[PDB]
């Protein structure tokens, strides 16, 4: 039975490839020849946040563009005031080996986790005034690679046990599992309408997951190497991914194939983080080259570089209004660009 | 404003606590323990006492933090980079596993998987700034098994008496040491067992020597 199922799967994949070629009347670069380029990028550092003792791994902007949360190896989950460089919180962790973090859209909760296989959710708005553990979502056999809030009741996580999960915060149990990947899942990026998200994994293929239905809608086997980071395009019909093969790939959901490859002759290092600008015109990507590259997402040309870090770049984010760019590296510094 | 100034004062208080935690982090030394469940690592930890698992313990005034990641089912390539700041990497493997095979029940020894892991971890560029410690467990069980089962089935390159447990120890040690292609680094080896209470002094001495070698390299004295 196995051989006939494999032959049917191969025929279905060939039909998908034939449909993708059939609808590929043009690429993105063949119609952007009539639009002006972005030109020179002259962004400068506005703030430097110096409060970390060891390697920074993750950050997430708040929806008010004023507060940010960052995670680091030293066991402090630090919440920063972006305007006055004040330290808002320095939350001690039970397990210092943290890889990801998230900030709730209401500002009431934060999430964290790592090699402990537990997603810890902390309450920022308590009667006691201190930040304490509210939930310990232990349900994985591999490392917790990414968490993002939908609200104060539901959180979407992806981990290293090939499973993605929708967790119910109030109950403490999983709402649903997403057992579609074959390798460790590294990152997820949520749609602004909270209905869909995109996850990527070591099997070099991105998957679109439906939060409520529990099924995968699209599989994109367009990569040569491990997918590291994903950022969703603001209009809800596209996304961009990064990987170890030094090519940043812009995918379109409705086209069901890739729109554009980003590569350059002097880049041989993998991609660790990606983010979009407010309009989606400028794509930001962090590399092992110790800098963050500004790429013109429509013209395909290299727009600029922000090089204010000494160690490997680990995290990159943009405010919801596009006001500021934040970068963080293993050198225990954060930088804010504008 | 008054709220701005109070927020700055609270930030300074947080910075004071961060400085205290920085001092404690300097005092703390991280240690990574690698190995599988069948190596008897729980008995090793029991001897050392007197998700990711933390094992803090104290010396007379030196604080050690042993890290056990062996419970996790994952691909090491996409998370092991966070252990660059570990002073020395410890590999705990048993000497009695040559009669045992992998879960696939094929013609592959668990020692071959251990060697593959050994070379895979050493060839990572993040760990080429630290030392390697090799713990060879179950030496008494090795002594019993070499008489039960002769040292012939997995060892085509062995030259010595087939019942000589010391020759077995030295040969397995030599095969492990020869796997390191970088002459800049040294492997600190120890022969341990379930009743060996001196493992903590081996760890202390090996970590001290690692720190001294890192200092001598940093000082451009060698």
């Amino acid at each position: 039975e196995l051989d006939q199922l494999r032959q049917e799967a191969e025929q279905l994949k060939n039909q998908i490839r034939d449909a993708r070629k059939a609808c590929a009347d043009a690429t993105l670069s063949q119609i952007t020849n009539n639009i002006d380029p972005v030109g020179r990028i002259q962004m400068r550092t506005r703030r430097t946040l110096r409060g970390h003792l060891a390697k920074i791994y993750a950050m997430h902007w708040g929806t008010d563009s004023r507060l940010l949360v960052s995670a680091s190896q030293d066991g402090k989950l630090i919440i920063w005031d972006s305007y006055t460089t004040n330290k808002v919180h320095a939350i001690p962790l039970r397990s210092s080996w943290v890889m990801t973090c998230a900030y709730a859209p209401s500002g009431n909760y934060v999430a964290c986790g790592g090699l402990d296989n537990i997603c810890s959710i902390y309450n920022l708005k308590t009667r006691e005034g201190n930040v304490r553990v509210s939930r310990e979502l232990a349900g994985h056999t591999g490392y917790l690679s990414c968490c993002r809030f939908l609200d104060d009741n539901q959180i979407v996580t992806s981990s290293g046990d090939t499973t993605c999960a929708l967790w119910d915060i109030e109950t403490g149990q999983q709402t649903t599992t997403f057992t579609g990947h074959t390798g460790d899942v590294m990152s997820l990026s949520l749609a602004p309408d909270t209905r869909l998200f995109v996850s990527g994994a070591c099997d070099a293929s991105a998957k679109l997951w439906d939060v409520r239905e529990g099924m995968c809608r699209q599989t994109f086997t367009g990569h040569e190497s491990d997918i590291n980071a994903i950022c969703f395009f603001p209009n809800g019909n596209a996304f961009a991914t990064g990987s170890d093969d030094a090519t940043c790939r812009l995918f379109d959901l409705r086209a069901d194939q890739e729109l554009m490859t980003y590569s350059h002759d002097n880049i041989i290092c993998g991609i660790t983080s990606v983010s979009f600008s407010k309009s989606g015109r400028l794509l930001l990507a962090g590399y092992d080259d110790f800098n963050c590259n500004v790429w013109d997402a429509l013209k395909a040309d290299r727009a600029g570089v922000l090089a204010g870090h000494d160690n490997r770049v680990s995290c990159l984010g943009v405010t919801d209004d596009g006001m500021a760019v934040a970068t963080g590296s293993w050198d225990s510094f954060l930088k804010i660009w504008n | 404003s008054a709220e701005d100034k109070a927020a700055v004062e609270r930030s300074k208080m947080i910075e004071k606590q961060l400085r205290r935690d920085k001092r404690d982090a300097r005092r703390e030394l991280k240690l990574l323990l690698l190995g599988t469940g069948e190596s008897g690592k729980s008995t090793f930890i029991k001897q050392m006492r007197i998700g990711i698992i933390e094992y803090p313990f104290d010396l007379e005034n030196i604080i050690f933090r042993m890290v056990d990641v062996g419970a996790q089912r994952s691909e090491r390539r996409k998370w092991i980079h966070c252990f660059e700041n570990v002073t020395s990497i410890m590999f705990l493997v048993a000497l009695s596993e040559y009669d045992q095979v992998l879960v696939e029940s094929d013609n592959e020894n668990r020692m071959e998987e251990s060697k593959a892991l050994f070379r895979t971890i050493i060839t990572y560029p993040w760990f080429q700034n630290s030392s390697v410690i090799l713990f060879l467990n179950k030496k008494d069980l090795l002594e019993d098994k070499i008489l039960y089962s002769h040292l012939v089935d997995y060892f085509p390159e062995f030259d010595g008496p087939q019942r000589d447990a010391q020759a077995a120890r030295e040969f397995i040690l030599k095969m492990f040491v020869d796997l390191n292609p970088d002459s800049d680094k040294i492997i600190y080896s120890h022969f341990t067992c379930s009743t060996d209470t001196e493992n903590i002094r081996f760890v202390f001495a090996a970590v001290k020597d690692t720190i001294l070698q890192l200092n001598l390299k940093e000082y451009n004295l060698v």
Partner: single-chain antibody
Amino acid sequence: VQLVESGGGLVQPGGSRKLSCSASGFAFSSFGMHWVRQAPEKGLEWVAYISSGSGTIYYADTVKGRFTISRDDPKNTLFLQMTSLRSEDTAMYYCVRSIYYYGSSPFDFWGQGTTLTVSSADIVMTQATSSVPVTPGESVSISCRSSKSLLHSNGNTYLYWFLQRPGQSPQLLIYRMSNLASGVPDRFSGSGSGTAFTLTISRLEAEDVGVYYCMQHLEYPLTFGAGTKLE
């Protein structure tokens, strides 16, 4: 989350007393602490502030040089040493906890209170109306004026609104005129300019009886309004 106060009673003029405030149920050491006073025929008058870690201390102009504020974090107890006591210092005293940062909710818990009986450039807060008779279910608009503009260059206007029910300690209603305090129902709101303030109440409940305070937090010393009662 309790604050149990002691060290009060009836004293003679010229004496001294040590007040205590026992804190329980919360992370006391991270909080700033206030002492607040209220005469029987007057509204609340702010006395003193000590920051977390004792990094800074502030006194009112009529308080400085006579009263000493102190704290003991490992026993979670606040102290106040008051010397040269005058007849004007007879008041109900309150132990108050606060946290100051962007998005925080300071003054969200007021203590039990204690009774002590004794045998120029500041911003003045004006509430001309002493009381308004009301009917449940109707809306209410209560104004407040400040002598200075409270609009800082960061965009925030540092006005707070409080409710002091009869026989109860004051409860926080609104801070910075946009962020409703936790535990307070959504029928309360505020609005206004940098100097002219309005508290708007829709669908008034019986439990809303009490004295309403407006307060400025632009510069130290802190000052309180006269207070408007709903009858």
